[PDB]
């Protein structure tokens, strides 16, 4: 159950209590819900890592849906991957399915307006 793979930018979320603490922060956050049994999730893996380098002011947080069904049920996640965008505890937007360029555009547009 223990491991530490070298991912400089993307966080792995391991509990509802850790999710709620991250999403409550006064920081733009993107939570990406994925699971092993999800082909489209594999298409988003490298784009997500590149996005995390592209937008350092943003926390990119991965949620393994199989390990964290409570977080899935809390947010009504129905399809994987789903990306949820949040700040100081509020839902700002989402991207359903393997649409990395749409997610990039949504994050970019919010950051533009935070200036
Ligand atoms: N997504
Ligand atoms: N949220």
The answer to whether the CB of 81 is under 6 A from ligand 1 is yes
**CB count in 10 Å sphere of residue 91:** 11
The answer to whether the CB of 77 is under 6 A from ligand 2 is no
How, if at all, do strands 90-96 and 59-64 pair? Answer: unpaired
For residue 84, give the ligand nearest its CA.
2
**CB count in 10 Å sphere of residue 96:** 15
Compute and round to an integer the Cα radius of gyration of the chain: 13
Closest CA to 65 of 51, 76, 57, 50: 76
Residues 6+ apart with CB under 8 A from 69: none
Protein residue whose Cα sits closest to atom 1 of ligand 1: 82
> 93 - beta bridge partners?
85
Residues 6+ apart with CB under 8 A from 43: 98, 100
Angle at 78 between CA 60 and CA 104, to 5 degrees: 35
Resolution (A): 1.8
- Experimental method, per PDB record: X-ray
């Amino acid at each position: 159950v223990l491991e530490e793979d070298r991912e400089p930018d993307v966080i792995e979320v391991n509990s509802l209590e850790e999710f709620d603490e991250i999403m409550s922060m006064d920081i733009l956050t993107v939570a990406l819900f994925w699971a092993d049994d999800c082909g489209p999730c594999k298409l988003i893996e490298e784009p997500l890592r590149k996005m995390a380098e592209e937008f350092p002011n943003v926390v990119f947080a991965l949620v393994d849906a199989d390990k964290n069904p409570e977080i899935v049920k809390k947010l009504n996640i129905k399809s994987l991957p789903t990306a949820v965008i949040a700040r100081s505890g509020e839902y700002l937007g989402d991207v359903v399915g393997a649409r990395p360029d749409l997610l990039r555009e949504k994050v970019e547009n919010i950051l533009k307006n935070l200036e």
